[PDB]
Amino acid sequence: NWQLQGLCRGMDSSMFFHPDGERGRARTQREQRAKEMCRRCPVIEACRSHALEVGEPYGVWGGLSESERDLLLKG
Amino acid sequence: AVSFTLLQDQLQSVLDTLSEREAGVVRLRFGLTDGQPRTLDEIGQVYGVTRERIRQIESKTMSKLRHPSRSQVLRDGTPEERLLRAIFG
DNA sequence: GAAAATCGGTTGTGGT
DNA sequence: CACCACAACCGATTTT
Ligand code: SF4
Ligand SMILES: C[As](C)(=O)[O-]
């Protein structure tokens, strides 16, 4: 239900997931573009707690990169 | 209700934006190819990778299908229901 | 349910 | 441009 209000609802996953093999500068700038969208997003908080509650292994969710979440949950 | 046609339609549709490998794996796993699910090992053989790499690719794909960017099938026995319930399960 | 170990493609540098 | 050669790097993949 909270998904309906996400700012990324139409443009698909190009922006939030890394294609196979992406490294270096392309990888970090994709992450930045995504985060810049999330910061403006009216449901960031529900997006973030969802990703951490269920532990979404991939993508940018709620303004957090994959490895940010991996760092916030471990232990 | 024969809305099962248009659910296929829009599911073919969302699969079409995963990568080739991500789509092939979901297709082999649920048997949206010949109506016969394949084990994680059979899929490893097809892709020349271990079963564990298949499970990582599957997981990424589930992440992508449940992301808000493109998960417009939360409108509710059969493989396509198997895949649906496997996304929101 | 993973996490750690190792492999290998990429990137950047510098050559002919 | 090409090719090569590596080294470092770090995502992909294999092994616990
Ligand atoms: S937070 Fe980011 S990912 Fe989550 S809905 Fe908003 S824009 Fe989409
Ligand atoms: C070298 As292979 C593609 O069988 O992992």
Numbering used by the authors:
A (entry chain A): 16 to 90
B (entry chain B): 450 to 525, 534 to 546
The authors write:
Mycobacterium tuberculosis (Mtb) WhiB3 is an iron–sulfur cluster-containing transcription factor belonging to a subclass of the WhiB-Like (Wbl) family that is widely distributed in the phylum Actinobacteria. WhiB3 plays a crucial role in the survival and pathogenesis of Mtb. It binds to the conserved region 4 of the principal sigma factor (σA4) in the RNA polymerase holoenzyme to regulate gene expression like other known Wbl proteins in Mtb. Here we determined crystal structures of the WhiB3:σA4 complex without and with DNA at 1.5 Å and 2.45 Å, respectively, to elucidate how WhiB3 interacts with DNA to regulate gene expression. These structures reveal that the WhiB3:σA4 complex shares a molecular interface similar to other structurally characterized Wbl proteins and also possesses a subclass-specific Arg-rich DNA-binding motif.
We then cocrystallized the WhiB3:σA4-βtip complex with PwhiB7 that was used in the crystallographic study of the WhiB7:σA4-βtip:PwhiB7 complex, which enabled us to collect high-quality diffraction data from a WhiB3:σA4-βtip:PwhiB7 crystal and refined the crystal structure at 2.45-Å resolution with the final Rfree/Rwork value of 0.211/0.243 (see Experimental procedures). A structural comparison shows that although both WhiB3 and σA4 in the WhiB3:σA4-βtip:PwhiB7 structure are involved in DNA binding like the case of WhiB7, they are dramatically different in how the Wbl-bound σA4 interacts with PwhiB7. σA4 of the WhiB3:σA4 complex orients about 180° relative to the WhiB7-bound σA4 along with the PwhiB7 DNA and inserts into the major groove upstream of the AT-rich WhiB7 binding site instead of the expected −35 element. Therefore, the observation that σA4 in the WhiB3:σA4-βtip:PwhiB7 complex binds to a physiologically irrelevant site of PwhiB7 opposite to the direction of transcription initiation indicates that PwhiB7 is unlikely a target of WhiB3. However, the crystal structure of the WhiB3:σA4-βtip:PwhiB7 complex provides valuable insights into the general features of how WhiB3 interacts with DNA, which is the primary focus of our structural analysis below. Although a “RGR” sequence is also present in the Arg-rich motif (“RGRAR”) of Mtb WhiB3, the RGR sequence is not conserved in the WhiB3 subclass and only R38 in the motif inserts vertically into the minor groove of the junction between the WhiB7 binding site and the −35 element. R38 forms polar contacts with the nucleotides of 2 GC pairs, in contrast to the preference of AT-rich DNA by the WhiB7 AT-hook. The other conserved residue in the Arg-rich motif, R42, is near the edge of the DNA duplex (∼4 Å away) and thus may form hydrophilic interactions with the phosphate backbone in solution. The central minor-groove width (∼3.5 Å) around the AT-rich region of PwhiB7 in WhiB3:σA4-βtip:PwhiB7 is characteristic of A-track DNAs and is significantly narrower than that of WhiB7:σA4-βtip:PwhiB7 (∼7 Å) where WhiB7-bound to the minor groove of the AT-rich region.
